[PDB]
């Protein structure tokens, strides 16, 4: 047998009222350690207090929501124990109110939004947090902390915008995600956002290709001609027109696969560029328009 | 001493007064202030004056159904602290202000159906947020709604919005409404529904809406509900199609594609004003966000402006912090990034 | 080619299509253009596009009752030359324009009840003035009405305006409407009714639920013998909330006009203002006169206000006795002023 | 017996389309002559054509309304006849349309309006007609011509010392529908109809405005507030207002009946305030002395 040892211990938190506060606690031993949460000596028992145990059985997470001050502002402890041991760790919870929120306290500029990804594909959940000093960002899936400590797994967190990138999606990834911003000043939770995993739909991906490229047209001085540009591919290209560097079809909703340009009062020869765009490539084609006497 | 053509019972405890179809033009003056039940249906009252229900501290049920009430004076119900139910259905109200519903401490039933209410004042329900159990705003002209007020109505069990122009329902709402059993969102302008506590008893009706059938409604399609004749309006492939008849696989979202970039490079050496453009396209329509070189997201604040199109306008540059201004087009199906490098 | 939950029998010649309570969002596309009867009640149609009923020259009955139709495109009912009846009741229409009712040559039944119609375009009924037998505009937001158009509707027999905000009804109307049997003016803002051909094969004219002003101008009506339709007075204070047919004829009083603020006989000889305000029951009408002609106001060189004020550029030799005349149902008042 | 003789014969009219055209024809004899109207030889018979006979039986009036051109543009004749005679007179009716209306054609600027008069009282119906030259004005009560040729009857028409109709000592017979008619050498135009109603005499006493409670003199300290009460009586009840010498202190929207209490604020200088009572029987005044004593 082996006495319990802490693998992760909770730290001193400082969240806002009405918000969230989570305490993570994990331990290992032989046999498996059971983790109990206490407030002021007695085991926690409240409607706003929920304990979520890890899938490994390696521990649990004490979640407090919504934060009520100062009824929750106290000392909470984690007691890990098995047949051959009993250890504990205690931490402090501070709950501010909006009146007492200091300038520099973490603020969610942009939270995660609803996203749907197919299986075995890559999904990304964004989160932008501000504050003084710069807050570090962590993630929570279904009240449990997302393990991104492994820099080389399917689930990673991008350095610098600490967004969560989920590669090779599986059904287990489907759940409720929420972003957490924490600095030396305190901790703020973002709104929850659902991730859905649908089955893999095998669609063919082909870069944009001009099925009907623009032809060169000769015209009388002022002067009117219609030029046809058609592109194909999967996904279907958005076709636009340009005059060298600047766009010629501004403020329009870029048509799909086909764009016919109309010229009027042509008094000078010019070259007009047709551009087709997709997420798989960008192709171009110019048409020579001349003004003959 | 009962007003003409009215039926008045003055036997304690229930002092009742009924004036249905008596051709009233105004609310009868000098009506006994010890009245418990008051019913003025099917008349032709034009407006409600503050003097009409002045000192009725014993009134518990007030019915003004089927008139032509187009205006309710401020504090008209200020002294009706014993009022449980209020009926203003089938009238010509155009708005619901806070000063009109002031002093309704015991209001538990509020019916404003079949009016022309264009706007409900935020926190106009303050007098009875903790007591209200029933709220009807069906058959009106509401395009918006103070959801933040609705979210505080704990004892609310029936909320009906049968025929309005409501475009969207706030996501954070309905989290504390544990007693809510019926929510009617039939016939509105709802393009989508938020993945809220819609699933549970509970009856959530959302038929007769111009549903946009993409991934954002996939979660709802996965539910097991009876066909309430819900129908899609967009996209073209699914127009006029019954919602629950469509297989889950056909609810598609299209990743964002940034069509109109700055072009990857920009340069201004002085305080002169600069402007950047970013326009994305996809299904649903992507949301554009900009970032500072310091990795700070830029919002609608001083010296910086962002438009619905996505164009970022900066007026007075410091240039002390020159770096890569990146454009991010977020979408339910993915993200797009088009960076620009300024100095 | 029938849509789900719809009952369409396409057996020639009478093509019938019914799509009641099927949760429609739009008018079903590809409807057989030889359709005779088409009923789309109790759905959720938001707008009517012109393409919806493009070439339906065989259509005789169109029913769009109980939707949320808030917009009807121009020429939406064009080419509906065979249409007899049209139902748009219980919708969200805000106005009735001429380009919307264009091409309804055979229209005999028009129901626009229970909408939010704020204004009816003058002569928007031109396509079917001579054919209409039934016109419903009950439960709307009409304060005014193209009476000049209504007056031409000869075959009209039932006109209903059950619940609007109509302030006044034109006097000359209804003189040619010989087939008219029912006129409903309940619940409006009518202060009075004109001594028209109201009294008369039978006729039922309902005018209850109005803020009637009970003076001499309604004396003619009180003298009539009609059944009590719960008519009630709103003004003056002495007669407020009192039932119309319960008041003896002697209590309907008019007060002669009295000019309170005269000029006083009181310029620059190079630029034009005169004051005249009368008071009485009913509110007097102010008219001005030239020294040897009748002065007309609201014009090029002369302007007159609702208050009675005469207002541009004075002539160097048009000075005389300008008299002010305050006309009223109970008498006239005169206060002359002489300016130079 | 005595054969018919014409006492009044109709004249040539020229009205507008949609308007009215009336032909007056009267005769006398023993026995009384019966008058028949003819168009192109045949007795008139049409929906728009009505014949209204005088109450005395001295003749009748052919009324055509509304005027339709040129179905009515013809020659009409009046044939008076009894057992011992038969005479006739004929006139021509011309019906123009708005396109052919000349400048100078009679136009009703202001027509008669709804009127209610008590018995034995005086009622007046207005009419203002324009045109070139100046059109003569006549009146029609219930499709029949009002005889105001007699300048010395209860019913007169004002011209000298606006051809309005003045009805003195009203009787029930005066109750009816009146309409003004403007006629010159160019043509004839009718005004809109207006009803005159005769109600019973309400015996009320007529008393000029009298101050029951005139304004009293009040003294006040500099700034300063005082209420002044002014009460006037009479039948009809006086309109009480306030003035400061020349300028009005009371608006004609809030103008009270019989009682007006004036409210003063920030009185920093002594002044005289004029109270005025107004009725159709007189205008009386009263001054109140307002002084600023320490
Ligand atoms: C449009 O593009 C074509 C080539 O893509 C240009 O034509 C060439 O111009 C160069 C010099 O400018 C010559 O060396 C080539 O011989 C030309 N080739 C051909 C086929 O003409 C053309 O000048 C451009 N026109 C404009 C207005 O920019
Ligand atoms: C930032 O402010 C601008 C206005 O200054 C907002 O622009 C409007 O936004 C609505 C929709 O959000 C559009 O319908 C309007 O047409 C826009 N008007 C103008 C003048 O731009 C903009 O939405 C705000 N953007 C953010 C991210 O807050
Ligand atoms: C000409 O006539 C109209 C009325 O027919 C005058 O319009 C009125 O203007 C006053 C204020 O100036 C308003 O109180 C009234 O409500 C208006 N009348 C209506 C029916 O709305 C107009 O002012 C006159 N023109 C001039 C120059 O005086
Ligand atoms: C170009 O397209 C437009 C489409 O409306 C058409 O009107 C025009 O005639 C066309 N011009 C030429 C030269 O083809
Ligand atoms: C209201 O009620 C009580 C008795 O019912 C009465 O004493 C009080 O004066 C009333 N309030 C007013 C303003 O009249
Ligand atoms: C004058 O009249 C007003 C009316 O409310 C009143 O408030 C005020 O007290 C009165 N002042 C005096 C001195 O009577
Ligand atoms: C008010 O009237 C009297 C005359 O009755 C006069 O003597 C006095 O000067 C007047 N007071 C003022 C302030 O004009």
Numbering used by the authors:
A (entry chain A): 28 to 187, 196 to 328
B (entry chain B): 33 to 232, 244 to 386
C (entry chain D): 33 to 232, 243 to 308, 311 to 316, 318 to 356, 358 to 386
D (entry chain C): 28 to 188, 196 to 328
What does the paper say about this structure?
Type-IIa receptor protein tyrosine phosphatases (RPTPs) and neurexins are the two major presynaptic organizers. In mammals, the type-IIa RPTPs have three members, PTPδ, PTPσ, and LAR. These members possess a large extracellular domain (ECD) consisting of three immunoglobulin-like (Ig) domains and four to eight fibronectin type-III (Fn) domains, followed by a single transmembrane helix and a cytoplasmic domain harboring two protein tyrosine phosphatase (PTP) domains: the first PTP domain is active, while the second domain is inactive. SALM family proteins have five isoforms (SALM1–SALM5). Their ECDs share the same domain organization consisting of a leucine-rich repeat (LRR) domain, an Ig domain and an Fn domain with 35% amino-acid sequence identity. We determined the crystal structures of apo-SALM5 (LRR–Ig), and PTPδ (Ig1–Ig3)–SALM2 (LRR–Ig) and PTPδ (Ig1–Fn1)–SALM5 (LRR–Ig) complexes at 3.08, 3.16, and 4.18 Å resolutions, respectively.
